[PDB]
Amino acid sequence: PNFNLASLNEEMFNVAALTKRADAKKLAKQLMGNDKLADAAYIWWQHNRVTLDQIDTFLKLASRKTQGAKYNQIYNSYMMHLGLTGYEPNSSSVDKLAAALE
């Protein structure tokens, strides 16, 4: 419907409250694979005035050790919305994931 249900779920991610090696990688994993989920996650952190240096050390730890390549992909949704990007000098990759498989 048009109505918008509002609730308080701070026990889903809370990267600013969660700290661990594997425990973190696991939380980020589902947040990097599940789109329908990450959609509410990437927006959740920002809601709590999260910092890139934070979500980065979290997601990155879950992804490769190359400054988290795919980390900026699913996270781009935020950096793009706020328009405050400009951390790294440059980065390249393949846009195959974007293309469908039909």
Swiss-Prot record:
Q: Where is this region: Effector domain?
A: 17-87
Q: What is this protein called?
A: RxLR effector protein Avr3a
Q: Where in the cell is it found?
A: Secreted; Host cytoplasm; Host endosome
Q: Which GO terms describe its cellular component?
A: extracellular region; host cell endosome
Question: Coiled-coil ranges per the record?
Answer: none
Q: Which organism is it from?
A: Phytophthora infestans
* Induction section of the entry: Expression is induced during host plant infection.
- Share the record's PTM remark: Proteolytically cleaved. The cleavage site directly after the RxLR sequence and the high conservation among other effector proteins suggest that the RxLR motif might play a crucial role in the intracellular processing before secretion.
Domain observations? The RxLR-dEER motif is required for the delivery of the effector to the host cell cytoplasm but does not bind phosphatidylinositol monophosphates. The motif is cleaved after the RxLR sequence. The RxLR motif (residues 44 to 47) plays a crucial role in the intracellular processing before secretion. The Glu-rich part localized just after the cleavage site (residues 48 to 59) is required for homodimerization. The conserved, positively charged effector domain (residues 77 to 147), rather than the RXLR domain, is required for binding to phosphatidylinositol monophosphates (PIPs). PIP binding is necessary for accumulation of CMPG1 and Avr3a in host plants.
**Is ATP-binding found in the keyword set?**
no
Q: How does it assemble?
A: Forms homodimers via the RxLR-dEER motif. Interacts with host E3 ligase CMPG1. Interacts with host DRP2.
Keyword rRNA-binding in the entry? The reply is: no
Say what the protein does.
Multifunctional effector that can suppress host BAK1/SERK3-mediated immunity through at least two different pathways. Manipulates plant immunity by targeting and stabilizing host E3 ligase CMPG1. Preventing the normal 26S proteasome-dependent degradation of potato CMPG1, and thus potentially of its protein substrates in the host cell, further abolishes host cell death during the biotrophic phase of infection. Also associates with the dynamin-related protein 2 (DRP2), a plant GTPase involved in immune receptor-mediated endocytosis.
Misc. remarks from the entry: The AVR3a protein of Phytophthora infestans is a polymorphic member of the RXLR class of cytoplasmic effectors with dual functions. Avr3A(KI) but not Avr3a(EM) activates innate immunity triggered by the potato resistance protein R3a and is a strong suppressor of the cell-death response induced by INF1 elicitin, a secreted P.infestans protein that has features of pathogen-associated molecular patterns. The 2 polymorphic residues between AVR3a(KI) and Avr3a(EM) are localized at positions 80 and 103, respectively.
Q: Which gene carries the instructions for this protein?
A: Avr3a
- Family stated for the protein in its record: Belongs to the RxLR effector family.
Q: What is its main location?
A: secreted
This protein's UniProt keywords: Acetylation, Glycoprotein, Host cytoplasm, Host endosome, Secreted, Signal, Virulence
